[model samples]
Each structure stands twice: as structure tokens, then as C-alpha cells.
Target chain A: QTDRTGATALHLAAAYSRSDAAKRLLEASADANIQDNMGRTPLHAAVSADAQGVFQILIRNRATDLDARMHDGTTPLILAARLAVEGMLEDLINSHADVNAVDDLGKSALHWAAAVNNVDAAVVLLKNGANKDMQNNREETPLFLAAREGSYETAKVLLDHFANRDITDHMDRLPRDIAQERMHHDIVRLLDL
Target chain B: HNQTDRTGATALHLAAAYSRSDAAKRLLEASADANIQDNMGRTPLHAAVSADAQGVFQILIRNRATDLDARMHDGTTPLILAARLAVEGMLEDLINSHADVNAVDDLGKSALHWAAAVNNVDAAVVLLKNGANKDMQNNREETPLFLAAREGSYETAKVLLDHFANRDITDHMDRLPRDIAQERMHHDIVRLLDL
Candidate 1:
């Protein structure tokens, strides 16, 4: 029922975005929240695969834990937001999954969204009550990550939300300092603003 | 139209991992961008090296389609992958291709550092014979020997020891290889250190 990587048929169904097949399996009593070797559930697989239909199906299955975490503490919602899937993010929020969940590195979904410049996803998280100034274990807020990664629009979103620009990292350097070092002059200016 | 998949993996990236040299050649012939980094920031060369697909690697190298030194999201270069996976002949091929032997990842761990940590003795030898700084320290100031001792990698630690690597070198936490071995309760390595 599983591959060498311990991926089950449901995992494959979700990973390949085969929504029809996934729905059939779910009705046939497939364990909706079964985790693979990496502790990634079918929901995580669906989100990472960008399988919207399959993801929705899994999200509605009462057996599916919206906050099921992988080995690295990645939740399905975190994966969706991190990958910039707006539909998935909205639905995950609607389902009442914890928006402030942190990974092993203390990075939340918002951290990933900002770091990757997923502006829409960042907005979704923020609008849904994600802490704009939440810092990771590195003491880096989402704005700090946005600055370091040169995310102009995401930084602007955080700034518009009145995100604290003075948050410093473990290095005691502010977001603007990192932006300047990485030559993200626009983000540096945005942080300044 | 089939340039990339839902995972942002291009056809060339697939060719590098699962498909053979035939598909790779065809893609390259059709103007596929060889250096396109996927969503994970890994090039086809990294994928090929990750999967140990020698044929795809050969095709990539022959076509000059690979950035031999290209880094992944974590700053792990092809040389680092080759060393970490201990891919047969791939390590040498990458070095022969002029991959930087001393290139460090985001954590400042070089190819040799990973090789020793993962008990990749073969890669350690190849890298050592090819100008790798055996005792290079990472961000934590931990050397390969320190990592080897911490992970109980006896063979690589012995290799480093035989190569006259300094055993007394301490990490950021002021812990020597012996200190780490004692903390890890690796009695054999503790005895092996003779310090």
C-alpha cells in the first residue's frame, strides 16, 4: 500500500493532484491524516502538490487535523501559505487552523510568505490575525525576512499593517541593515519609511 | 508548454532525476534552459547529483548545460551534494569540472565537512587529495573531526587524525573533538583520541 519512501496510495493521489482518485479513496476509508516517513500527512501532500480539489476534499474530512505537523514542524497551512497558494490559504484560515503555528526553527507561515515575497499570502495571514511582528528563533520578524529576501511588496504590506520596523535579529541588526547589506535598497527605504 | 511542472520543476530537471540522457538531449536540443533553478533553488545538475543519475550528469556536462558550481536554496553546491551523497565518480567528475572544493553552504560547512560528518570516507579521500582544507571550521567553529567525533564517525575521524589534523582545535563552545566524544559517550572514539 506504500512505496519505498513510505508514501501511501492516498499520498500519491494527493501528490499527483488526482482529486477524483483521492475522493474515491477517502470514501473507501483511507486514513485521511495518515503520515508518511517524514510525518507529512495527506493534507500536507495535497498542499505541497498544489492539488486544490484534493486539498479541499481532505480539509473537509473531519479526520484531517488542520494543524498536523511534519518532522520539521510544517503544517499544511504553513506549506500552502509558504508556497503562495491563496485559495488554499483562505480555506485553511476558514477552517480555523492556528495561524501562529511555528516550525522547528520558530518560523511561522507568515515568515515563509514574506521571505519568498508571497505578498498575497502574507496579506491573507495578516488579515486573518497573524502577528505581523512575530519573530522567529533568529529573532527575525516577517518584515525582517522580507527585507533580507528583497520582498518589496510583502515588506510594504507589513509596513502598511504598521509592523514594527525596529525589530532586530540575533545579530542585533535591524531589517533595514540587512536590506542595505543585501543591496535591497527599496526594502531598506521601505523599512525606513 | 511542458517546461515546468506544478512543483516548478522544468523538463530538464525531470530529465536530470528520472528521465535518461535521451530525453535530456532532446530537451537541450529544443532550447531548454539548463540552468533554470526549480522552486527549491536546485538546478538540473543538483537534481542529477541528488538522484545519482550518471547518464543525465554526463549529458549535462557534455552539453555544457550545467553550472557545476550552482547552489541550492541552502547554498549547497553540486560538489557538496556529490560529497554528501558520496556518488560514485560524480565527486571526481565535479572536481575535474572545476567545482570549488572549499565552497561552503549557508552553515559554512564545506563539501569535506559534510563528507566527514556523513561518514563519506570515499569523498573525504577524493576531496583531501584534491586540496580540501581538512580542518576547515564551520560557523560553529566545529571542524570535520569535531563533527565526526560528535556523530561517532570513527573512520573519517581516523582519516583526519592520520592526516595530522589538529585534535586540540576547539569549537565556539570551547569543546574539542574529545570533549564532544565524551559528551556523546562514544567510548571507542574517546579512547581513540588518546588526549
Candidate 2:
């Protein structure tokens, strides 16, 4: 049965973790990537629910790659970053997802993690060789992103990983400048004057 | 005098002279006083305005650096400094802090007069909203609207006129604000003021 937004039965079932319903539809050869009016596929719905088991089940049954992006330029990695689900994020990244892949804002997964101060996620990404120096359209590196939002702990981690202090964003202002502008005293001090 | 840095500036004096958000945060953490003045009698708030550091200006304001309507050695308040610097954001923040936008500087120029003199329409709009005295004159007895017209800022002239600025106000030489429009060489301002 079709629902509002023109989403089909398989779409709702997978989105809300109706694994048995999804299995039944899968047996019927339902299109795994069939999009509704919102262009959200079954994977998109299942991922939103953080249904890790359902995600695995879908992938095993030929679901799309975990790195797929939506029309708004948000990839599964970006969406998981926004959700702050460590387990879901770890699963995606370990599945060979592109952590440094940028969306519309030219922001990689690390930038969002830094902006949101997700220390655990940032560390996992950093260990996997996600480039912290990658900038978006605004020339804001992950360090610049962290400093702008006053994410002290995340900033410290990035700095420890050798994030540049002298890098200027699109505004011609340095990360230290942003820290100063935001009145983040401790960060200003840690950048070592 | 032990050993000043380049520009003959001391760290404390420098920190107190310019309102750098980062510098202020560091200085205060290092125990710098907000009331500390420079050789020119300008405070950190004064310096912040000069640097156009609106964010740092707010930090100083929160730290109680006396948005107290104090004057510099030149009789200029923080609002006057912000206007002179054309710091639109800082000008709005200063106005919100109840800074006396009409306070006269050493030249008897209010913030509006400075904005008009400099052809800064954005600053003028902010000052007018903060209760700038549209009719107040400088040492030359020129109203802000007259100064704006004389400075050739037609946009600024329009703003002042819409704010009820008197079109007929003249300067010390009995020249109406529009009459001094010789520098601008634009008839639109003079014509708009009905000169």
C-alpha cells in the first residue's frame, strides 16, 4: 500500500525496521533502491532507524552500498554523523565508506564530527586516515570547523593530529582567529599564543 | 620604558588598546584589567571598535569594560569610535548596550556626524536607531544630514532625511549642509534636500 509522500509498503517497512515485511517484499523482488517522492530508498529508511541488523540483512540481500548519498548531498556517512550513532557509524566506515567524501557544504565526515564535537567518531575517522586538512567551499578545514564551534576537546585531538594553526578560512581568518572571535579562552591558550 | 615592543607598545597596553576577542580572552585569563587605558586614553573597548572586532567587543561588554559612556582623550565614546571605523556590527551592539550615540567627540561630532562625514550609511542607520540626535551639530554647527549631504553619500542623505533630519540646518559658515556639497559635486543630494 502506498502512503503519504508516495512511499510504498516496502519503504515504510524497512524504514521502521519491519525486517519480516522487508524480507517478504524482498522475496517478491521489490526494488531495493526504489525511491518515493522524497527520493528516500529502503536503505535510507533503515539507516535512519539505526537498525544495524536490518542494515546487514539488506546489504546481504543486495542492498545498495553504504556510501550512497541523497539528493540534498547527504551521504549515509554524513547522515550517520548527524545522528551520532557510534555503532552505526563504525559499521559504515568499516564497510569501506568514504569518510573524507564531501557533501554540498564541501564538508567531509570529519568536519561534521568536529563541528558536533564527536570525539569518539572523530578518533575512529582519524585513525582510518581521514584527512583533517580537507576544506569545504568555505576553505574551512576540520580544525577550522572545530575551532569555530568551540569544540575544545575535538580541537585538541585535531591539533594533536597536526591540524594547521595558520590555515585561514574563506573569511581570511585563521582558526585561532575564530577561537578568539568566539571567546574560547582555553583554546586560544592551547594554540600556544 | 624598560623595553617596549615595536610601535613602542607594551603587551598590557596593547591588550587594553584593542578589543581583540581572542586577545581579550587571553589577557583577562592572564589577569588583564578592562579599565586599563593606553597612552592615548583609549580602552580595550575603544581599541576593539577601532579594529572592528564586534565579537571581541561583546566579550568586553560582558566582562563589564564600562560601556559606561566614557570618552577617549579625544572625547569620543565607543559608539563614536565604532561609527568612525564603519564597524556596522559593533555599532549595533554598542547601541544595544545603551551607548550614548549622541555624545559629542572632541570635534563636537556625534556618532551620526562621523557617520555622515565619512559617508557611512550602514553606521548612520545603526546610530539613528540608537537614538542619535539628528539635529545635533558639530563644532561647525552642521547637522548629521548636512554632513551626509556634504560628504556626497546620497544613500546616507536619503536615510537621514527619512529620519526627520532638518534640510535647512547650516554650518558655522552659514552654509546649509547641502551648500557644502561642492566636495561631492552631486546635484542629486542638493536637489533631494531642496537646497
Candidate 3:
């Protein structure tokens, strides 16, 4: 029987990066897309566990629902971006996954990267043609989130990529307006010009 | 530093919040004010419970100088915080220390409501074992059974039923627990409630 979280053996093995065991289960016809009680697939567990090796195996086996959202609307790319796992991001990008895919919250991988100030991850996504001005449910772009969160490096990266700075959010405030309100003077200066 | 931060939390509060039990003990031994309230009116006991630092909680309790029922600005007690987070051991420890099991927060939600909402059967069991009222309603007049059924928490509902939770109770909307379960497409919970 599965655990109380409804995590199967395959889910656990994938989460722990147990590639050998995962392969065995897959060969035994384990359902790769089986969702747990939280609606997380094995691929989601693998990404959360940071098991790049097992991630490759799942991809090779055609577990290519890279944009599949979990119960919390978290896709594998969003998880990778949140964790700032550059290797996984590159792998997913190379595999032609939706670089601009948005979650139920309307946040894309770039939004997460900017929110956490993961410059390298943002660079990867931007290089892979992620839309810089994609707005979330709050109408805030990746650059807007970077500025609001005071993620200087990520803001710089987005600006360097010519991300639009004039986009207004739900409150009709520019990134500069938020930076001023939050007293992030450095971000204010950056957004000013 | 021995000084209070912007949130009125001292080094002892930070240490307890981060589960640094050794540092907490050192601070307490150094005569740090154990009962100091933060900007939210929360004491170190609230921080320790929120952080799930059982050792820190035990240390504060053993001092016998901490108010176990100290309320925050939002009327949240340590027991209520522990229940919302489903910190099982901390809950048991609080209950063992005679903390009120039925203590409600500003939302009028007891620990049982949170446990039921999150489907934390273990935490619910602990609260129920310690005399948590199963029929306790929140500000919305929704009981723990109603929350469990709405959230499709089958295991928690089963445990509450085993403890004889009332099946006929309704919320402010006049919807029964089974009615909520049915609306949410939780057929299993609907079945359990129907029986």
C-alpha cells in the first residue's frame, strides 16, 4: 500500500534520486504519471528531489508532460526555477519544453527565477526565448517581480535583455513605483532610467 | 545581541524560532526575559511552538515562568498555532502541559478545525484524545466535521466519526457536512457522512 501521502514506491524512488530502483519500477510497468494525494506526479517529485539522473530517465521514457501542474499549480519547470537548479532548467529547455509556460497563478519560470534572484536560471530561460514581459495574475512581469523583491542581479539580467520597464501591475503601479514604495532605493534608481 | 529587534524579538526568540535549543538554554541561563512579547504580542512560547522546537518549548515550560496561554495580537495562542501547522509532538506537549485544547484564534478556529482542514489525522487524534470538542464551530459556524468533509479528508472524517462527531450539524449556510462533501464531489466523504 502507498503511504498516507499517497506516494507510491516509484514516487519515493524518483524523489530520492534512486535511478536504479526507478528504472526497475518503470520496467515493471509502473505508471509514471500517477499523481499522489497532493496531485504531484513522479516527475514533480524528481525535480523537487533534485535528481537530475532520474529526471533524464523519465524524460527518455517519454514522461514529457513537463508543463503538468501539481495541485498547487506548480509545474516541474516552476519547481526547478524555484530551486534554481540550472542543469535541470537547461535540460528542460534543450528538450523543447515550454519555456514561457505559466502556472495557475499565472507565474512563469522566469517569474520564479526573478523572484528568487536566480540570475543564471533567468539567463538560461531568456536565452531559450522566454517572454520577458509575460504578465502574471497580478499583471506583474518578471522584471516587476525582481524589482518588487529587490532582486538586483535578476533585475539587471532582465533589463540587459531589454525587458519592458513601463508595464503596470494590478495597482497600476510601475516597477519604479513599487521599488519606491518598498524603499528599495537601489531598485528605484535602476528602474528610473 | 541581548537587545530586542524591530519585531520586539530578542536573541532568545530568534534562537527558539530557529530551533537552536542550546542557544535558548544559554540565553535563559543568562537571565533573558522569557516572557517578553513581540510586536505581534507573541511570546517565546509562540515562536518555539511555531518553529516546532519541542526542546525549546519544553525548556520554556520547565521554567514554569512562561504563560502557556499567552495570546498574540490576533488572539492566536501557542496551542492554536501548533494546531494550524499540525505540529504533532508540540501539540501533545502543550496538551500535556494543560494547554487549552479548545482555544480559538481570531478566526474562532480550534486546533481540531485546522487538523480537519489539512487532513492531519494524527494531530486531530491528539487533540481529540486531549478533549477537543469535535462540534466546535469557527467564525463561519463550520465545524471540524464540515471542514474535513469539504476538504475530502476521508481519514480525518473517519477518525472524527469514530469519536462520535455529530453528523447532523450544519454551518451558517445551513449546509450539512454531507452537503458540503457532495458539492465538492467528494463522493467517498459523502458516502461516509450519508451512512
Candidate 3 lDDT tens digits, A1-193: 2788989898898888998887677655577788889888888888888887678766654433667788878888888999986488888777667898888889999999999999999999999899999999999999999988999999999999999999999999898888888888888887666
User: Which residue segments of model 3 deviate by more than 4 Å?
Assistant: B1-195
The 10-residue segment of model 2 chain A with minimum total lDDT is A56-65
The TM-score measured for candidate 1 stands at: 0.49
Q: Over 4 Å off in model 1, which ranges?
A: A1-193
Summarize candidate 1's per-residue lDDT along B24-136 as a digit string, tens digits: 86676555787898888898889999999988887676444357788889999989998888889999988876789999999999998898889998888888999999889
Model 3: how many Å of interface RMSD?
25.9
Stretches of candidate 2 off by over 4 Å are B1-195
TM per prediction: 0.49, 0.47, 0.49
> What tier of docking accuracy does candidate 3 attain?
incorrect
Residue B20 in candidate 2 has what lDDT? 46
Go through the candidates in order and give each one's C-alpha lDDT: 0.86, 0.74, 0.85
The deviation in Å at residue A109 for candidate 3 is 0.6
Mind giving the per-residue lDDT tens digits that candidate 2 earns over A1-193? 4678767887788667777777567655576676667666776677788776556555544235566667766777777777786576776777667888888888888989899988888888899889978978999988888888988889999989998878888888998899899998888887884
Of 1 and 2, the candidate ahead on lDDT is 1
